[PDB]
Design a binder for this molecule. Sequence first.
Ligand SMILES: Cn1ncc2ncnc(NS(=O)(=O)Cc3ccc(CC#N)cc3)c21
Length: 167
Amino acid sequence: VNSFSGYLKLTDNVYIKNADIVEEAKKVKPTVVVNAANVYLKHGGGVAGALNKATNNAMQVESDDYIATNGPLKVGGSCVLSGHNLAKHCLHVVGPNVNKGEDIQLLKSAYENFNQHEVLLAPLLSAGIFGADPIHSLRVCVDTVRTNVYLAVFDKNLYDKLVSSFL
Ligand SMILES: Cn1ncc2ncnc(NS(=O)(=O)Cc3ccc(CC#N)cc3)c21
């Protein structure tokens, strides 16, 4: 028994809620919140900018030090950094951005990172400003992640469409 509330059950291990991931993080303070990162960990907009703003830019400061030491992530890759005031840890995961020509087949590799964590609060990878088909992202999530994932999807029209079209 964990502290996530009002999530709707999709499968044995995947749950979904119509919510802003930052609001969920601040209320739950989960062990792991997933960021929809890019390879440079430049958190300007979308999930990354919303989370970073909620940390008062501390996420960006930590991320810049990480990149200066380690170089960029891979598309499909991830790193674990602090969750600051939102979570114990933030798992920064790079989904393919279809707006930059990045291979959609890398979405499965991106979701595989979630399997290294028993429970995660996460957004729908490559959705919204990343330009991928969201029904597709949810399908890949369900078929790839085996650990317990709590999805927060800001868009009500997206949330209703995702639930009502789910197979
Ligand atoms: C950006 N942002 N900020 C907080 C937060 N929490 C959960 N989801 C987010 N965005 S999202 O993952 O891309 C899901 C999403 C949101 C909106 C749309 C509209 C279109 N078309 C499509 C898809 C969030």
